Design a protein around this nucleic acid. Structure first.
Length: 131
RNA sequence: AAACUUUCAACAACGGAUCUCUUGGUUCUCGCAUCGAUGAAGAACGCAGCGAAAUGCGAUACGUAAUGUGAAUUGCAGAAUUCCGUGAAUCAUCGAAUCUUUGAACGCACGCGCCCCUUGCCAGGGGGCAUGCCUGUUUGAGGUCAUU
């Protein structure tokens, strides 16, 4: 069997289900060198012109109910960031997402269990936590 | 004498010489430019029911695809055909396919490796990986200049 390091370099796992999986993140690296070239040129207009995961979601979760498997960690991370070198815009977006989720939950009032704890106020709809 | 040597008329054998002819050769004149990595010429193996040569064909193998003709092919068997019909010919045209192994011959050589993928540790199935050079994209390394 191909080792994890060897498989990653080529791209313990089954080779049958990994070889076919070899098929914009790599292309984005060119933007760094283009920006460096623009900086070297000393003009910012070209830099401004240069400046101007749905696919993975479906395969991981082919159906909406399947999202519940990872929704625990998803909500945990989102709520942790909502209260936390992360940019302020990322924090604001995470807080807005959590606020919208809470508003929708309150609209339907789909809550069954709660538990105030030292770690945080636990909740159940699916279980989720907020600090 | 018979037998046997020799000249000649007739009869009986060789060979195709003479005569007649040819889907032939040679020579003259006229129109055109038409080989090849999108794989040339050439060589080997197979293909028709029966097959020596020639021609055609490449496991779709004396052919497959398409149009015209309209009732065949023929040495033998065999097929039919609704033949008033989108339909037979070993017919003609031929623009669409297949195109075995070699061969400029092209994975590495003087047997024999790799990407791919697939339908079921492992495999069938399908295309490629030769060298010289031109344009473009990607990565890596090294000389100049800048670095308050």
């Amino acid at each position: 069997f191909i080792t994890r390091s060897q498989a990653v370099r080529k791209l313990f796992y089954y080779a049958k289900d990994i070889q076919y999986l070899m098929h914009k993140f790599r292309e984005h690296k060119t933007f760094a060198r283009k920006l460096t070239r623009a900086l070297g040129r000393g003009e910012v207009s070209s830099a401004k012109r240069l400046e101007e995961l749905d696919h993975i979601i479906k395969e991981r979760y082919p159906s909406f109910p399947d999202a519940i498997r990872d929704i625990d960690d998803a909500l945990n991370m989102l709520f942790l960031f909502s209260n936390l070198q992360v940019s302020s815009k990322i924090i604001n977006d995470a807080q807005k997402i959590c606020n919208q989720w809470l508003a929708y939950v309150a609209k339907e009032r789909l809550v069954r269990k709660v538990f105030v704890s030292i770690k945080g106020v636990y909740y159940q709809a699916v279980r989720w936590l907020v600090p």
